Amino acid sequence: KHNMKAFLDELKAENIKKFLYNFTQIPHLAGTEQNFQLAKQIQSQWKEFGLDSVELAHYDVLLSYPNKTHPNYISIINEDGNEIFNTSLFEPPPPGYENVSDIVPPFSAFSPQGMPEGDLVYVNYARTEDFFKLERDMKINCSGKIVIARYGKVFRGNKVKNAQLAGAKGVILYSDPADYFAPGVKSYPDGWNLPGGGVQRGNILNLNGAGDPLTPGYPANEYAYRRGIAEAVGLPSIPVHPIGYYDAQKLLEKMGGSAPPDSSWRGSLKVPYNVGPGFTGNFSTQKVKMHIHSTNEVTRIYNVIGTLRGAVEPDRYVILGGHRDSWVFGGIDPQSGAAVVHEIVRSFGTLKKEGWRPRRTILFASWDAEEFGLLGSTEWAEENSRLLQERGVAYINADSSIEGNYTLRVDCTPLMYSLVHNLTKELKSPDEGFEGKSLYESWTKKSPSPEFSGMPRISKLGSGNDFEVFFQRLGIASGRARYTKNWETGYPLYHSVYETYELVEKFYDPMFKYHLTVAQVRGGMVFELANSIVLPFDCRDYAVVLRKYADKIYSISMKHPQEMKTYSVSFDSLFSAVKNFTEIASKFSERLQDFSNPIVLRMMNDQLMFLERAFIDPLGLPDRPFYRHVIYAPSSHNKYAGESFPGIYDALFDIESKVDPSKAWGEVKRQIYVAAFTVQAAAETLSEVA
Template sequence: MKPLWQITSMGDLVYVNYGTVEDFMYLTRNLSMNLTGTVAIVRYGKIFRGDKVKNGEKYGCAGMIIYSDPADYVVGSTDRVFPDDWWLPGTGAQRGTVLSTNGDPLTPFYPSIESAYYLDEKDIRLPLIPVTPIGYDDAIKYLSKMDGAEVQSSWRGNLNITYRVGPGFLPPHEKSKIKLYVQTYNVKKPIKNVIGFIQGVHEPDRYVVLGNHRDAWVFGAIDPSSGTATMMEVSRAMGQLLKDGWRPRRSIIFCSWGAEEYGLIGSTEWVEEMNKILGSRAVAYLNVDLAIEGNATLVARGTPILHNLIYESSKKVENPNPDEIAKGRRTVYDTWLANSPSAFNPDLPYIGQLGSGSDYAPFLQNLGITSLDIRYTFDEKYPISSYPMYHSVYETFNLVSRIMDRDFKYHQAVARMWGVVALALADRVLLTFDCQSYANALERILASVQTSYGALFLKNGISLDDVTKATEEFKKAASTLHKRIETLDIKNPLDVRRVNDQLMQLERAFIDPLGIAGDAMIRHVIYAPNQHNTYASSSFPGLEAALFDIENKPNQTESWKKVKKEISVITFTILSAASTLKEVNDIGGL
């Protein structure tokens, strides 16, 4: 590709808070602002940066500046920042892709290999407006001079200025405009994934896949190198086990991904290339993007079928924090529970849902492979969007070794956790998957939808009865399967294989090959990236997308038809998933 130069015409500056769709709605609906031709300045946080840009394009902005506000990246005074502490200095700018698709954009849905057909650049969907990141030392020079109404309290950052929405500047700068000049180069370069393979003894055609990406925006000491170092340690430990005579029941694959930061390219292309093999053989994908983003507690996200295994594994890992051990919290699980009890069951730690933003996405969304992501995180008392040095030039080994994890014990805890989960899935005769946890999750999602939209559904003649019946059917099938497992003869390899295949295939049953909300790359009907924030996860994502801002949509009849269609898709999908858990002779039509 030829170098691409992008220049905006001069435009008035407008402040759009975090750049969420709700923020843009507020300016255009509540303040009646026309944003066409303006340059938006938004702060990092809340949503994926690419979604900020997509929103800016939708509302007619000519360009966008994204900055890191102290409210989201500094606690306390901006006088005490790195290298004295882990807070972001004013010169720190957060880099990152704003591409809204995963994989090589020239080969959507197919692997980017030599024999592939590559689209012309003019035929692919790239961001249409220039974008640049800046630090808060630069941002204050513009924000402090802005004209217009003062912002509402939730829009205020922590710069010592009066935040205004614009457009334009106060006197004597009222005639000034913003000229955004961005130079980018679109080039084709080869990338490499590095794959390691430990062949299993009894079920070599069943794969437990561990993955981490190794590319970084700058030095990447945390993202991704903390995860890379951790995966190297896990692979070293398993290598030692091999030397000692051990070999797993199932095969274990280690994957070091390239070009994750450009849009999950390495992992997506590998999943596309190995589609048929992984679709039939992969047991689970276990991801560690970054091993630590803090040193307070474990954080885990994964599909419900893995929840019990995650809890069990965390109870086996020694607590890396001596202060926590002194409080009687001897394991990773103990601190995790104390810091993050689940709202559904305070006797268990909270496990989040998977959206996108890391390499689990193609495994879960393309193929329906059960997935997990773990890391150590910061104390929730800090009202920050991410670890402060994220994707900045200050994310260095010095930051990690001197401030965040001096003895690398938190890295070690994540390595142990990762290894324990992997070995359980690779070595146990029966897969440690709990279908009943999925049934409970479906019930919670359904109850949440009913609470949020029940009155609106009633008003528009919408019923959730079919989804409720499907969920009950799924719960019954899950319970029956687990009762059958309790009496299973684990010495009968064919019976074991049949049940394990049922457990392994369950997640795949939630895949809709037509995609979710018009996106054929997002296919999981129960959990998928949020339509307006790729980082976050939505439950019943197609339904959530159909319901978003529905009362303000011009064609109410067509809008509610879409809602009915999504409810139908959810119902069918849950019933299909339930059928995979039943006995082989329990089939419709018999």
């Protein structure tokens, strides 16, 4: 039989292992020859595996690289201008890789060039609230200072934006052992902890969904007209560089000025964590000097796009995509996800060779330049946006399959909650102590829902990965699934040269059973989306969450009862719309189970497919035209986190500090109107069509 079980049984842990090993022997940095060679290999194999067509889609996009003959580093400089201490030029390479060429040294992608010199201020995680505390409470002025921030909690691009708006003239990012060294575990190669010489690479853009900084709105094809650099989207205006905690210790140990305001500002190094500005008395005339010489360069990138044509609805697309480019070896990020995709393609291809076809078309994608700002997925979606928004059923992401070995982690649209519950009930748990139990059971036990007994936690989609264009710009139902750690007791070697095949095989998943379970969840979701007669979306689950988010945003507003009275701020319209959505969704579900008629079915599947689409506002969110989903957007303070009713949330945020309350409260009301209208409009797409 050619059914989901056949698909699932064909997936092998041993294949995923072989592919991971294959994909992680050399670096595959976006825009490099090695990553083009890997693209060609994947293309060749997906064809071998049996896909109907497999093409490269290339774009010329803005990327960023250090200067090979003018290295980036940071100094402490004395009053004579002698550099008395220099940060490292490279991470010590791991065992057996000390002769691998083309390891890009640690750098912050898209930093401008410069050699700013100044006094340090320590800004904790450089979050919005950290700067509030410094500026409003501690009265510390960052203007003209070099800020040093620890990585963690929020996307590093947001840190840089926040430092820039505070007036900083440079940013130093570092990995504190408090956030990247788990007590009682050894440093790589003897354990999975970050060594003192390890450094996290990563871009520091604020693209807000734009894709290639030079071509917002349109694919960066051969004839594209490019913005000049001064008008590019999302580039930082101050130099930025990341360091490890051996080097950080040397920069922090001399810090003077004010004490940290409390213990949430102290990491694990043997230093006081003084905020500054500047160094204590004896070293007061020493300064910190950055030397950054990286260059932004338009560079060719290559997506691989595989097609498995649907037998019945070839014009309906279910997309499985994840990136291929890596900072260095990509042992977890992304090749632990790419090896899973490769095995998924292999399995579907086995069925195809025996005469099977899915009902709908399945598209498989190996995205390029994800690490430089989701550039490959976004350019391809800009190119194909008309096909995607009229034909896109769902997008399943497939980056890193693991960041831990504890339990499942799923982030998705409410439209997929029931699909995910049902599927995981049919999968075997790989967890110790749950042999013979379902994945649903182990996941529910280890990660209970905060609101529903006997159900697992499922998180909202944020951003910082390739689903962003499909979900937040285009309104295509999206989901992701991986194995994660127990947050009560992400991974230390993230974006370091130490993230290798050996890291995974030795310390995360020696038997590749967590990879296999992730392949079954991702593959199974795709199978059901592409094959179920009725799309496996339950609009009633959206109704439930919409009420929860409405309660939540109302509560935030209700911290300001006097202003709500003065400006007549009412959430009545939003609750009314949510109530209507609930009633219409319930009635639609009845019809969906109560209708031999393929027009009614396809009519109903179109209503299901266009439901996520209905939450898109074509005017976008304020000052973020590529975030158009009115229910979800990436947090304005942290691109990784999802925010619900983001337009209202941002209008309320820090509202007590606005100098014109009338104007600020009017904008709250405007966003309430936009949200109520959008929920009601979405609900009406589920009404009888005539």
